[model samples]
Target: NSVSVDLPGSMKVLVSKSSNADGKYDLIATVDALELSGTSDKNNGSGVLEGVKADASKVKLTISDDLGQTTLEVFKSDGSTLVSKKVTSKDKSSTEEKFNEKGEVSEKIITRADGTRLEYTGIKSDGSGKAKEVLKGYVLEGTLTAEKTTLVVKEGTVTLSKNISKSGAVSVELNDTDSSAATKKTAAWNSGTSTLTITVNSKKTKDLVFTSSNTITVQQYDSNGTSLEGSAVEITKLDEIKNALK
Candidate 1:
């Protein structure tokens, strides 16, 4: 079964059954063009640009969609490019580039679905480029380096940290724990990337410090305290941690 719905702002939603899985439906939405006016789509679409401001009526949008990825290019009334946005659902990453009058990218923002956001401005936008990166938390500034990124997120008393590198190597740490590891605690998780689960000694306290350098520690045990192996578990993509935290 399939249906197509056209929205105001030149947007359309395609509702169809999943081609990859059985008995599943997906709603694919795209905006072929837009002349921004007021806020819509939860402030997404052509309504807002993070760090740049433009005349809502003067902003023109051209969008293209392929597979699970979409690219939106913003232009001025005169047709000069202003900003470019690319979003991929598979990786849960969204990127935006703010261009100068010359059509060179002057600023960029890459955000993960986990609320991890990185910003760079005054980019060279050319060969051997360099720019200044601004961290969301402490406002720390550093020279932008290719293939290197670190994210530190703090919510309430739970602080999550991750280091991203060129080899796609990533490590996560949960610091909402007592400083001392001497206390008797039970840590449990699956020994795979799919289900990165960690159950500490107490759910209320949640005092678990993830100190693993490469992979999270998984205690292959059962609820009855019996050793188990190769138990099928659910998968949690690293990019979806923000939703899990909620």
Candidate 2:
């Protein structure tokens, strides 16, 4: 099958072919008449010529075949001869036999006056299924970022650190061995979490030295001393010597 477009000064033509009984066909533009020549062959035996003026126009076409010569004459809107050319057919049996034995065959060629050409050849099927396999091999990933704080104890002193900017405030609660002696203190923060001393002010402080013996809980707070969450906290392990000294 073929299609064509023609205007006062522009033209375009397309051709298509289907080898198998199925209607599936491959279509390609044979000639961009306005840009190239005004004529083209549909390789499938059909072609179109366009962009002729309303005045008398002439067109010629030549078809190639193995059997004999063939020609077609085309007329324009002005009722003048637009095209005239000779065509030829091919010998089917000889061509098929040659191709079957050699697994390949030469194509029949058709040449036009405008320097455009057309040809016919055999078709082969592709079987890799690469497109479908590639589409199936895909995936995605994610990440998370948050503020974290840490508290470490070394030589019986505790250091607290945070990732906040500006001088803020934090509260520390010492869960000592004796509930009555548990203490809470407020510390000034720097740009990030900072180390603060957990001094032994009373005799019971001796038992609240190591992290296991005494747990220090730290909670971030606003300037007004309100408990602030969304801040992460971690505690560190202390050696036995530090625990004994405390």
Candidate 3:
């Protein structure tokens, strides 16, 4: 089916054939500019119909009121034109009417590997709105490690060291996440790798060095707490470093 759009000043409308199917149509004819006003308005912006059929998957239309003209063409997704037609305005204050077949509109759902999923319109390329939970996956193992370092302090027990290495690693199963069937990437590190060091001086007990190794493995769960497959774990990439700045 065909659709129509109202134009103001200099505006153009895009009409697609088979809202669901792909193909292109050819342009058949163009009408010349005619004067518009009062009784002469009937044929002012009207043009002859082109004898071409839009058989392509997508089509583009450009109309230039300033130049008193409009152009229509059908093309493949790669910009290859199947047919082209041009039309001109007959009068300055007149309106134009273009005709075409009505198009179909439909919606479908797509699930991501991470469990995140969304519904999209037939003509849409990306997902829109929030994700909905339809299925759950597995949980995998993750690790976080830190580096060792020396400290420098000349006063009482060094409750806090100047330079303590801080770094770690994390690995998790990929099947547990929510994302389209596409690949999912997850990895993060402390922005600043700084630790606490303690020391003591002057007839005082030497400062006790406080070492720390904090590691955590979060169970895989959809934002909704759905468990996923753990064996699907994949360690695609990881990085561990010491004395890193946040």
Candidate 4:
């Protein structure tokens, strides 16, 4: 569904189909010389309004979605300083995501459901996101680059790292303890291929094809390409393996 309207001053609004649609539509509101974009609820003009200007001297941002969350942000004239406020209706939580002069995310302060605040500086350049467990007081941080990803939990001292290759191969390592060696798993995903070859600690390899998100086709083999006993199985939900186990 698509609709367009001409507003006063150089402002025009539009509702168009989004790339992924489920009661969602892309909304564009052009004001002055700047364009603000958002989404509409099934083209009903009810979703979040993005990139709004507060006034002539300062710029403001307002975002609201069907998920019952609203965000408000104010920026300076040079767009250097940003103060953002977010409110979530489901848990009644509020958060503030701070940005640097370069518009990169600098820190996040979250007021949880039960009235506790957690703050931290998140990833620097490539990746983004910071999470905290209010009840357990566990802080989790994550970072991602083009060829690598790292996640760490400060309280539990748990770290997970992944190294990616240009050929679509990935090696994952989990270090949960300071005393022992980390556990490792590797997966090979060829270009334009749907199947994934996975190996854990250089043991038997398994080839799995997940055509659907809910089920998978699994074939087991030894490192030397010898077929294993339980080969070629269709694994589904609810503790059921369709062909081999039955």
Q: Which candidate leads in TM-score? A: 1
lDDT, residue 57, candidate 4: 29
Candidate whose lDDT is highest:
4
**Off by more than 4 A, model 2:** 1-14, 19-62, 65-76, 80-246
Two-way lDDT contest, 1 vs 3, winner: 1
Tens-place lDDT per residue, model 1, 137-166, is 233233444565445545444455554454
- Candidate 4 lDDT over 147-236, as tens digits, reads 543433221333333333334254434343443322343456543445656555555466655332323467877657545546567654
Q: Write the per-residue lDDT of candidate 2 for residues 194-236, one digit (tens) a residue.
A: 3332333321222121122123233333333343434423323
Q: All candidates: CA RMSD in angstroms? A: 13.3, 30.5, 23.3, 13.2
Question: All models: lDDT?
Answer: 0.43, 0.28, 0.26, 0.49
Flag the better candidate by lDDT, 2 or 4: 4
Query: Which regions in candidate 1 have their CA more than 4 angstroms from the true location?
Result: 1-67, 78-82, 86-88, 126-141, 146-246
Assess candidate 1 and give its TM-score to the true structure: 0.38
Q: Following a full C-alpha superposition, what root-mean-square deviation does model 4 have from the true structure? A: 13.2
Please provide TM-scores, in order, for all candidate models, with all chains considered together: 0.38, 0.17, 0.16, 0.32
Order of candidates by lDDT, top first? Answer: 4, 1, 2, 3
* Candidate 3 C-alpha lDDT tens digits along 1-246: 433334333442323222232233222222222111111111222221222234433333444434355444443444443332223343432222222232211233333334332222232222122212122232111111123222222222111122223332211111113243232222222323322111111111111111222221222323332333242222122111111110
Evaluate model 2: give its TM-score.
Answer: 0.17
Give me the runs in candidate 4 sitting further than 4 Å from their true place. Answer: 1-80, 85-103, 107-121, 125-142, 146-187, 194-204, 208-219, 222-246
Q: RMSD of model 3, in Å?
A: 23.3
lDDT score, residue 24, model 2? 34
